[model samples]
Target: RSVARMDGDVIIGALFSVHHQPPAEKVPERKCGEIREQYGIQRVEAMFHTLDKINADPVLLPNITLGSEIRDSCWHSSVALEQSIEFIRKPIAGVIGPGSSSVAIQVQNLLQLFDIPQIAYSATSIDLSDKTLYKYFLRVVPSDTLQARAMLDIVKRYNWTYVSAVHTEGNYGESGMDAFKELAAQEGLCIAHSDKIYSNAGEKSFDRLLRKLRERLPKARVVVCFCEGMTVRGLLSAMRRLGVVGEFSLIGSDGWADRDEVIEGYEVEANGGITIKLQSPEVRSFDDYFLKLRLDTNTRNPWFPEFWQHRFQCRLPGHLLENPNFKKVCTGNESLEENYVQDSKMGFVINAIYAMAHGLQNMHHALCPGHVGLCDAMKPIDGRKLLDFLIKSSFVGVSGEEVWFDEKGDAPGRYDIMNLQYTEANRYDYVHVGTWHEGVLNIDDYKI
Candidate 1:
């Protein structure tokens, strides 16, 4: 999707895994479908909303207009590289997202070639903080290391020394688990069992993995899962099949814990579990706009039609077959409430874009001194200058928090420790039981 104003001087590029595309080596137990990821779409819209705000503001970028071109990464590093190259070919001021850290790493390598600055809204690999390797890469989200510390805090608080870990087979999962293990050693904790699984692991591989877990379950009563939702769902499915349920306590990373859709069917199994979550404040009016979204030929989003059909259980006229036996009819009046599209990361997305915007504004002033309209004349702002300004830029964002990059271009970590519990009538939800700031975990033991 492109948000543009006529004669706009600057463009910021965005990358997201907006739709779920099944991998070739599919896991039968893992039901990964061609579903539209509303979370990613919310982030995209948040960027647009931030850009609109910047344009409307008289003090910020008085003479310059901002434009954006968002691309779909498909959650693959290879796809992210291809799309990054496409955006790099253009005269974009800066780039945002390519959300997953594995994809972000690939994109960062390509972006560094041109000295293009990229500020990620969600990528949280601990390895990305190495400024020597990724000079132009930055992220608004906390690194996986902070998440590892929080996970360890829970273990320490409960005085559980022995535990097991399950992580996805990728940079995000591997790096996060590595940090957790390192801290676990320091805290005198013993890891009884550990396993890794691919998002596209075949049924045989998944079953074997499950068998290994079953064997190790007796050795460790506490389990920590650092996998994404897709892998977590697969693990839960296998656990259910093998009757691996009961008083086993589980710890989850933000990857699966934050997504309600992932935890829906496995609520009973995951009850009384603790998880780490990135803190976010609500974005006013964005939810209203999200529920009113519609799809048509003029809409650039191709996946919206399919999402609309699946979500509302109806077909559009273009995809309708000429048969009287078609069960579902297109009423074109389906509506989804604001609650269905709630995404906490909208604030992060808005902050990422604003960080870039604020930097661009500062760079414009520095380049064309004493001139408001001369920013366009100094067209194609130097990437190095923009990067320098971005690293030093600081402001209060829509989330009502101060946004700034540290010396290593990583944002300070702030997180909430959430406890998932079952309420009345078998309904399940998470409540904030504690918070982590800097390196301290302030948890109310009574709440837990």
Candidate 2:
């Protein structure tokens, strides 16, 4: 079976810098080579190399090999186009689209452009799920549209009818903010102000903006921070400096979901702030797997500095430390709970890899009868049969929800929405509201 993997350099790079570890063994690049040699997997192919080779054009291979000082975007397009065309020459086993939304979009677009079918591992943006594109693209992450709607519903329940929208210029913020705009308009909410704060470009003038909000829209009930870590931190600090500590509510999307920045040191500022987070409930389980694997392998992984810390924390509920039943869990340490949240951020990456393997296995078996290539089978003989084969297969994944794809490739299972805030007096310094209850899709297709 053949499996084509997509590379996510941005996310992987962030992981390396934050955790100081590689994907496996958690060693530095130089030391990791030695570690890999010890393990006997001599060739450790880079993600771009593998991703590029999977769909490379046969004719262009000699001229444009994967990862030659060439840009990745061009390489990805060439590979995708080749995959679509090559599938005709040799039936492909299955394609695994595991990179960014842009890459997934390119691959899915290419496949559709050539009338081929494939699945994507993680493309959170909602625009890619259009009926025109759904036949080929499948992803595990909740669409940004659903994420925004969940945040909107949570805010609406609090009766936050007026808001200030501060978001980064990245696609994550843009897609989410677009959803917010559409939803706010449909709900008749007043959008007091909206602006894009370029990330890492330095501090923004949020004080003037907050002042304007106070004077112009006294009715403002919420401020949505659609930026990622840096932007959210800047806004919180600026708001505090301006003496506007808790005058209005603040909300955020998944951008700030797993980070401790919001509640870091400024618990007072975050007391009324609401961040809509998509936290994987599998934090504890994955931590257990990692720990067991580490112990079994007896591998020293400096990357997992928080391994035992997280292992201990996931066992204890934060609120339970006050209760007799849970006090035994907190080991008189304050940082324990902090590490627990980080443990659960296993994305659909593992699931994606396994799903690709499963898809390839079935395709391989089906093709074996006639030595047919992966492309010969336009549509699977049976979608349900393929789904059952996956269900029965043994594999580990990162999503907290059960692994399944709807016929249309949307999330097959329900996801819980968590709204966060800090407590009064900030003793416990915790805030998690219940799951969101509703949403609305714009009447885009009904245009006259």
Candidate 3:
């Protein structure tokens, strides 16, 4: 019997169809058991069966069609970087996902020398927005600086007594951690435990980070994770090991809320509700879609069915009518209404493809055939031109809002607070709860 609903099958099939090749082996029973424990027996089997087939290959190269993937998160970013070099070195237009701010800037810095325009779908580091190197870089996600500002709104809203800071190592850890620390400080919040882990060097270091959090800040209710996915997991595991799993609440970065790793590692009692700042515009839209098309509009919340529903309802409802808003925002002016409830299932991957398509189209049309240069296609034309292209990019996407680039090629989009739920083994579910707002900042206005 087919476990996936019609719509779910369709989107999952289409988004990940590239992985269907090289036959899949039956899911090992033990892994299935692991899934059963994490999510539920039913969901575990489904996810295990599906991804086993999806990631069948030891090495995952972009199917010949999608071209390139940016290095944004850990595994995907690492894999994307490796693949990006090979693709661009041969003069192929590549899509790169940097694992984090550090890697993104490093890769952008390195790729700047070459004439390749690499688009990072979800890298949020502010430094990458620098016009010099990023002229060739395009992003489909919002920046972390913006995300951190949004999180500050939450700090204000909750009216919590205390907030502490915890970060991972390297650039992603330091930069985002530093930015958030400053943001929280502005709101009169004190840093509880400004801790970090060196898991790469030793597992014991992670144990120390956890023990200290439990020991020093046991009374502190909110702890923020400015760490990468791997470090976050290690920290989560340490929380369990040190018996502080449910002792305090946790907040993670947009990356920290990833479903795959969270569900696989711990059970419910040990896990706390996580507050993750939404950096990807795609994630916001995807949630509202599932709610509208699958749960509300129709009985079937299966992947693609719900996705298509959302594609029409929120992102691209006007595709049939050719409504300019649908052409631009995917849903019309109502796109922002969905906030934290977007169905990310197919949205992220689809938008990624859309961004890639536009980048390729821009690069292709701008270049004089056979010249094969990068700057020619990507040089910033003024913020106005970028805004114009974003407004008119209809055939390229299904959203109802304008998908424009900032002076720095990042999406001028909204951020929100999303919760991470460990749905099943290696499967995490996200829900968008509220929208985040930017703080008012002025320089030397009255302080002279």
Candidate 4:
């Protein structure tokens, strides 16, 4: 079922992982796990909020309202493939998501055949930038290629010539570590040990990986984690299981970007860790708008009820059967501010949607001059031509960051160097310690 939807002249497709994918062995019903809060609902509402602003604007995409058809990838490639098929069955101008790299690759393969411009908010595998393989694919997040270099810079700064490495078992992690390894060799950075695991590869595998990584001991205390949240979480959980909380320090990828969910109960294990995040600024207006959203008035998203129940652990009118996971009775007046509303990729998603709108504006100007609405010439939006326009799109997004797709359908790569440091003994939070761009890594030594 679709999540957030809007009725308009031209439709934009969306793919988000509203729930964690159920284990492959037990997916008879294609069941998904607990609904994700920030990644799913927050990002979903961001789209609705973004579209409302764009639609009401006087100039941009004038008279051409952009509708949306959002589908859940459940963080699975197979699930995304099926959803991509659904998009093809219907008319869609372009696609905006499918966060993970593997899922993006699968969805991109299908959409490329149909020429639908697919701009991802988070997918960052280096392989995806291969124009021949993914002519229709683009992303707001920087590729792992630059991210790898950023990680290397962090290592070089500390003079840690030898370190261990671990990555999630897929394109995002593998491709990133591959790039990191190639770049590390150039600088004579040696990886003392390396390990890999599936995002969902239970604690046992993580336990084994941890034991193996420790074989190199004091020589390699830092482990670059080119991994997703679940993978990082698994490692943290394993660290606890092995009674080795401070044994490893992680240099993480954007997958672990400042997300509270990834370190909720594992703050100790996450201590001394550093990670990469796209240099996206906060959208203060989005916070004000998002906090005001409620199930009673906001009916656009079909999955809001689920998100509410799971997020608050309470049942609504209220809705659905009582889930043991949710016990507290819902009060309609509960505040969303009680929850962390920040979606790290919010600015990126907004930029992606804006790119679609801007691209359409270019296509309209070229094909239908002076047109107020979608003209006959732009009736069935050509995927190939739309893609052309999309590639040429350049605009300042909600964060005031310039959004432009380069030769490889990639955005310019820049990163915030984040360190998970203790706040008050037991408490911890990620603080920006440095930044990395094309030619420089500006690390604030005082912060580190």
| Per-model TM values vs. the true structure | 0.91, 0.56, 0.58, 0.96
Candidate order (TM-score)? 4, 1, 3, 2
List all candidate RMSDs to the true structure.
3.5, 13.7, 14.8, 1.6
Model 3 misplaced stretches (Cα beyond 4 Å): 1-85, 88-90, 198-201, 258-260, 277-346, 360-396, 399-401, 420-432, 437-448
lDDT of 3 by residue, 284-311 (tens): 3333433332223433222332233334
- Give me the displacement of residue 300 in model 2, in angstroms: 11
User: lDDT scores for all predictions?
Assistant: 0.75, 0.46, 0.47, 0.84
Point to the candidate with the largest TM-score: 4
Candidate 2 error regions (>4 Å): 1-122, 131-136, 205-217, 240-243, 289-340, 369-400, 406-408, 413-430, 437-448
Clashing residue pairs in candidate 1 (N, C-alpha, C atoms within 3 angstroms): none
The CA lDDT at 44 in model 1 is 62
TM-score of 4: 0.96
Write one digit per residue (lDDT tens) for candidate 4, span 214-267: 888988888889999888888888888888868777888888989899998888
* Model 2 Cα lDDT, one tens digit per residue, 1-448: 1122223211111001111112223222312111111011101122232334333534211221221111112112333343344444422333445234544565666555444444544457677667555455565556776777776776666577777887776555777789878988998977887777644343446565556667755676577876665567766677678766667677676656545644576666666455555545543433343323331242223322223333343333443222332224544334323333332234454454445444545544654434434344424333434444443333345344566565556553233433344345435333444444235312211110
How much does candidate 3 score in TM-score? 0.58
